[PDB]
Amino acid sequence: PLESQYQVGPLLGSGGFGSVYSGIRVSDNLPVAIKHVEKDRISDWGELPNGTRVPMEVVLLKKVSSGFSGVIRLLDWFERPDSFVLILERPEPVQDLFDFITERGALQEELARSFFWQVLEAVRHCHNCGVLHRDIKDENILIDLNRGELKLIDFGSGALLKDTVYTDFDGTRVYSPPEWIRYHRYHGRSAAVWSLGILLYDMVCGDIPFEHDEEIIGGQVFFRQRVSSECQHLIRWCLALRPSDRPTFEEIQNHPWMQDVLLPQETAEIHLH
């Protein structure tokens, strides 16, 4: 049963990802999030290794939820006549990065460095587990405010990672790359790097760099805030118009701006506590 295993609390939010409620696991008081997604609202279906038909979101979450990582882990799931219910980790206290940036404005580079590094490690984890998220953005990143740890959420736009071209996309448009906008074609890793460029700009400038399609394909990055030249360079590199001119994850992590990152705990001590 579901309602005997979890004590449901208040609604935490709702949107494209479904509706998510605060919850606690009765058996040990572990805080959880209880996410409900209507079946009629799910367009991407997959199958478990044992061949059950589940949302692709569940398939991808299982693939990345083994062992420790910077991803919010799937702890369990249930099928209902008209919906699926997903039981997910819930850090406490917690705030999503969009809300955090909205509140605090542009982030100091030291904090952006630590956050961006954790997001890169998390996205590497997903790719290594065969999962492409396709909707990396500030709204899909949770911050554990006491531990200083960032966690990825919302795989409902994701796909199994592959080496061939993707011709479908339902993630967030202003984070999508110019090759998608123009040709409706992209490859997974280089499109991911583009979204990470958008995210890094957002962190250090307090807002995203592009709004309209013609801005995305023009790819001119204007800085509205004071940003170091090394950070500017890395951002412009991730936002290269040609996918092949973009850095690899290895190249991003070896870039001079990414050196000497704070650990999560010191990040929280300095910036979040």
Author numbering: 33 to 305
Task: Quote from the publication.
Pim kinases are interesting targets for cancer therapy as they are overexpressed in various human cancers, associated with metastasis, and overall treatment response. Our laboratory contributed to this area of research by demonstrating that substitutionally inert ruthenium(II), osmium(II), rhodium(III), iridium(III), and platinum(II) complexes can serve as highly selective and potent ATP-competitive inhibitors for protein kinases and lipid kinases. Here we now wish to report such a novel cyclometalated protein kinase inhibitor scaffold based on 1,8-phenanthrolin-7(8 H)-one cyclometalated with the half-sandwich moiety [Ru(η5-C5H5)(CO)] in a bidentate fashion.
The overall structure shows the typical two-lobe protein kinase architecture connected by a so-called hinge region, and the catalytic ATP binding site positioned in a deep intervening cleft, where one enantiomer of the ruthenium complex 1 is located. Unexpectedly, no hydrogen bonds of 1 with the hinge region are observed but instead with amino acid residues, which are located at the opposite site of the active site that is responsible for interacting with the triphosphate unit of ATP directly and mediated through magnesium(II) ions. The amide moiety of organometallic 1 forms a hydrogen bond between the lactam NH of 1 and the carboxylate group of Asp186, an amino acid residue that is part of the DFG loop having the role to bind a magnesium(II) ion during ATP activation. The lactam NH group additionally undergoes a water-mediated contact with the backbone NH group of Asp186. Another hydrogen bond is observed between the carbonyl group of organometallic 1 and the ammonium moiety of the conserved Lys67, an amino acid residue that directly interacts with the α-phosphate of ATP during phospho transfer catalysis. The phenanthroline ligand as well as the η5-C5H5 and the CO ligand of organometallic 1 form a number of hydrophobic contacts, most notably with Leu44, Phe49, Val52, Leu174, and Ile185. Related non-hinge hydrogen-bonding interactions have been observed with organic Pim1 inhibitors.
